[PDB]
Structure 1
């Protein structure tokens, strides 16, 4: 069973993501330029969000030996650790390795310091790395591990490192023609001089757009990679719902403090997911009445209408939700009165979706 979470976010003039040259990301959707936010940036910002700290238990590091050396007061094991890692399969200080944090910390410390071997020490270190699946951020984002076959030993093996991603974040597609804007900034030299000029004349590009943000949970995958338990799964689903509704990508927020909040949530339970990108194949051009958010919601509700009747799935109906705060932004302004449980909160929709997940409550699950 899999969960869809859709947002429609309007943002202040901001640069939440850039390419190598510094331009905001763009995609050619529907024959026109649409502003794009990378999925990996959203996944990272939700990973580092201030509510995931009880569940943030994954580390993506190449400085594993530094992590070992930090938790050792007087027993310097950093060359022995380095050669153990270098014959583990990583060849250099290494490549990027994904694992649980505290597990690798304590038990790699105990399995590395003992002077019992050098080959089987690397083998058991690699096994500890490969068995590090007790973390739900690894379960959501996904992780493989490929060591080298040259700088290794013939007696060192690797178990199956198969971890499937339980989350498919889409790239935030703008609901209109992208208007990329050019920002011209100077850098003031604090001390004066003859020239009366700037320390650094620079280039920055910003884009103000209404982004269609789209995520999707594979809850069945989320528990097939997080073992038999469901408490941690429900806690992670609630944590993501809070984080995504509450945090923003940590791009140039110090220069563009665009911390605006999602003006739309659409949660629909089914076994065949859908993005409402085709709701905005026609670019949204505003009219004198209403605003960009309302016109985008109107086109989205039109699409929800002809995919709830033309593409109707009444074997598994929509449990389509909203976050319409005290009904500020209704969906069905003309015909689409199919929003079964339109609410105006966030913890209520969290509790509701974990209720259709199973017999859970918001406060009891928030302890794992």
Structure 2
């Protein structure tokens, strides 16, 4: 009855709930190379035999998508709805404040999300078609703001095209201290734009069943 088995899946029927998709950047990939040299602490000053190597690195703005099945998680816990809500909140915190461990002792890219949008709908979808044009940076903008703007435009188009049919959609856009709003006007492109992770977890939990 552990959370680590019911939500994520088997350790190594038991069908899970997560749908972690591949994180795809919103612009042209720019791979760069580094010419390191394995220097010697002892001077020596002889027998050079050049120690030139190469290591590749990159910097990107990734768009990440996750899904959670509520009915499957409830069936996995067989009725503990409070535990299901707690696991959803724990995953909402973890997926926001956890980074991969690959080569973080030499690059230390401990960055944080610049905006999280939580949505509830019947059919599944991914807003990957928003960045079919690679993001080009201009004078009065940066990469993050333009990516968020393209996401806002795609959300606007989707809610203009795929909406109603006795099924309104609900958004829960979040940004740290509201520094990156999701568009301007247009009913704020979603419901309340809030500026705290704890408030986002609380809003989702109180929307699902009025949980704690």
Relative to the length of structure 2, the TM-score reads 0.90
Q: SS of the residue aligned with 1:205?
A: strand
Q: SS of the residue aligned with 2:93?
A: helix
Decide whether the 8 Å contact of 1:223 with 1:230 is kept in 2.
yes
- In structure 1, the gaps of 5 or more residues are 1-133, 146-161, 361-367
Q: Deviations over 1:68-99 (max 9, x none)?
A: xxxxxxxxxxxxxxxxxxxxxxxxxxxxxxxx
**Residue aligning to 1:139:** 6
Moved more, 174-183 or 321-330: 321-330
Task: Kindly state the Cα deviation for residue 339 of structure 1 after the two structures are TM-superposed.
Answer: 2.0
Task: Kindly state the Cα deviation for residue 204 of structure 1 after the two structures are TM-superposed.
Answer: 1.7
Task: Kindly state the Cα deviation for residue 336 of structure 1 after the two structures are TM-superposed.
Answer: 6.2
Task: Kindly state the Cα deviation for residue 138 of structure 1 after the two structures are TM-superposed.
Answer: 1.9
Decide whether the 8 Å contact of 1:319 with 1:340 is kept in 2.
yes
Decide whether the 8 Å contact of 1:141 with 1:166 is kept in 2.
yes
Task: Kindly state the Cα deviation for residue 317 of structure 1 after the two structures are TM-superposed.
Answer: 2.1
Q: SS of the residue aligned with 1:347?
A: helix
Decide whether the 8 Å contact of 2:8 with 2:17 is kept in 1.
yes
**What is the distance in 2 between the residues matched to 1:189 and 1:357?**
60
Decide whether the 8 Å contact of 2:73 with 2:84 is kept in 1.
yes
**Residue aligning to 2:119:** 268
Q: SS of the residue aligned with 1:141?
A: coil
Q: Deviations over 1:193-232 (max 9, x none)?
A: 2337589543321110110011111121112122221222
- Distance change in 2, residues 1:138/1:201 (3 Å): farther
Task: Kindly state the Cα deviation for residue 173 of structure 1 after the two structures are TM-superposed.
Answer: 0.4
Task: Kindly state the Cα deviation for residue 188 of structure 1 after the two structures are TM-superposed.
Answer: 2.2
Task: Kindly state the Cα deviation for residue 164 of structure 1 after the two structures are TM-superposed.
Answer: 0.6
Higher relative contact order (CA 8 A, sep 6+): 1
**What is the distance in 1 between the residues matched to 2:107 and 2:83?**
35
Decide whether the 8 Å contact of 1:319 with 1:341 is kept in 2.
no
In the alignment of these two chains, the number of paired residues is: 212
Task: Kindly state the Cα deviation for residue 142 of structure 1 after the two structures are TM-superposed.
Answer: 2.1
Decide whether the 8 Å contact of 1:302 with 1:336 is kept in 2.
no
**What is the distance in 2 between the residues matched to 1:334 and 1:341?**
12
Q: Deviations over 1:233-285 (max 9, x none)?
A: 11111111111111211111111111110001110111212211001011111
Task: Kindly state the Cα deviation for residue 335 of structure 1 after the two structures are TM-superposed.
Answer: 4.3
Decide whether the 8 Å contact of 2:174 with 2:194 is kept in 1.
yes
Q: SS of the residue aligned with 1:217?
A: strand
Relative to the length of structure 1, the TM-score reads 0.54
Decide whether the 8 Å contact of 2:36 with 2:55 is kept in 1.
yes
Decide whether the 8 Å contact of 1:188 with 1:198 is kept in 2.
no
Decide whether the 8 Å contact of 2:115 with 2:176 is kept in 1.
no
- In structure 2, the gaps of 5 or more residues are none
